């Protein structure tokens, strides 16, 4: 199965929905028989430049082993959901199970 | 291209044993499988001339292998083209 | 007529001319002076001295507002581009920050064809 690193930034006004979004997305991979290898909530962070007239976005990182179809559905959800200002999903050759420099 | 699992499956069918990866029948079957796979790709991407150039080498090379096989052992040539659903 | 004492001086330094505009932090213009309207034409309009006199006129047609601290933003590779900052400093203004704000496309629109003079 392909390995994907998913970083998405949630609107700061919905910082209280971040647990819910994480649970929902996590289940939508685990149900498709994929794995979850890393879950990091970097939290509220200052943005380098304003995004949609905002600063201080909420950062969530996810490193995942899942098939291409479920990840495709996940990206479509990001587009439709207006709580995530930006998201990037990147393919990775192997899994990662170490703290990011942000957590450290 | 062809997956690591799909190559092993084809080698088993068309070879004397697991390690007979270079027999002409095995090579022709591998080329045929990739050629048949790629037709779906070119249905959606007509303008992919660079990739189609690699497709031609597979077609042309299968022709050369089949001609050699026909010359050297007609019986396997007849048997192989029937099994792989080929003309000539 | 009001009192601000903290404004921003935008210097537009083009090759042919030098426009100085003084404004508040919000971006509402208070006054403006240009080298071409300060008594200089053609070969003299695009000179560092002409920009200095333009800076003098703008600092003289704005002091009704009593500006005391100034922030300078330079835009463009003009001839003067510097005499304006010096002239502003000498006109009785405290210069807080200097910033280059020249616009640089990140490989966008196509520029005009080269001049074959």
């Amino acid at each position: 199965m392909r390995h994907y690193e998913i970083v998405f930034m949630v609107h700061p006004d919905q910082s209280e929905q971040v647990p819910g979004m994480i649970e929902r997305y996590t289940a939508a991979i685990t149900g498709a028989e994929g794995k979850i290898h890393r879950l990091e909530d970097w939290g509220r962070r200052q943005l380098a430049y304003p995004i949609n007239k905002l600063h201080k976005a909420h950062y969530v990182l996810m490193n995942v082993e899942a098939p291409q179809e479920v990840i495709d559905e996940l990206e479509t959800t990001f587009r439709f959901n207006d709580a995530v200002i930006r998201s990037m999903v990147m393919r990775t050759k192997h899994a990662v199970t170490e703290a990011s420099p942000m957590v450290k | 291209s062809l997956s690591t699992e799909a190559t092993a499956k084809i080698v088993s069918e068309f070879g004397r044993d697991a390690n007979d990866t270079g027999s002409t029948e095995v090579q022709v079957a591998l080329l045929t499988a990739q050629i048949n796979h790629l037709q779906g790709h070119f249905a959606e991407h007509k303008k992919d001339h660079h990739s189609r150039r690699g497709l031609l080498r597979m077609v042309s090379q299968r022709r050369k292998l089949l001609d050699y096989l026909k010359r050297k052992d007609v019986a396997r040539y007849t048997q192989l083209i029937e099994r792989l659903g080929l003309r000539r | 007529r009001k009192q601000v004492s903290d404004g921003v001086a935008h210097i537009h330094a083009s090759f042919n001319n030098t426009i100085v505009t003084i404004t508040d932090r919000q971006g509402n213009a208070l006054g403006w002076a240009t080298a071409g309207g300060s008594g200089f034409r053609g070969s003299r309009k695009s000179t560092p001295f002409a920009a200095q006199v333009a800076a003098e006129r703008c600092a003289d047609a704005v002091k009704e507002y009593g500006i005391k601290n100034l922030e300078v933003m330079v835009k463009g590779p003009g001839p003067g581009r510097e005499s304006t900052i010096r002239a502003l400093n000498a006109a009785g203004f405290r210069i807080t920050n200097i910033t280059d704000v020249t616009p640089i496309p990140h490989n966008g629109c196509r520029p005009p064809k080269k001049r074959r003079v």
């Binding site: 930034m9 430049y49 995004i51 990147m90 420099p101 | - | -």
Partner: protein, 67 residues
């Protein structure tokens, strides 16, 4: 000289490490050439991709005067 990454044998630059990348971007925010830094070419390309990915995520700024 002294390519820093090859000294530690880093496999991939990992855009998330903002502390490292700040060394390789200038005050204005554009990337410093490998000629100045001393980085090897292979790591230089990885470094450029990492910085560009960080800019997209707004971990790093494109230019000094976004706002």
């Amino acid at each position: 000289k002294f390519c820093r990454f090859t000294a530690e044998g880093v496999q991939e630059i990992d855009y998330k490490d903002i502390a490292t990348l700040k060394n390789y971007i200038t005050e204005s925010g554009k990337i410093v050439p490998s000629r100045i830094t001393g980085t090897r070419a292979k790591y230089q390309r990885q470094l450029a991709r990492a910085i560009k990915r960080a800019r997209y995520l707004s971990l790093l700024p494109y230019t000094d005067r976004h706002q």
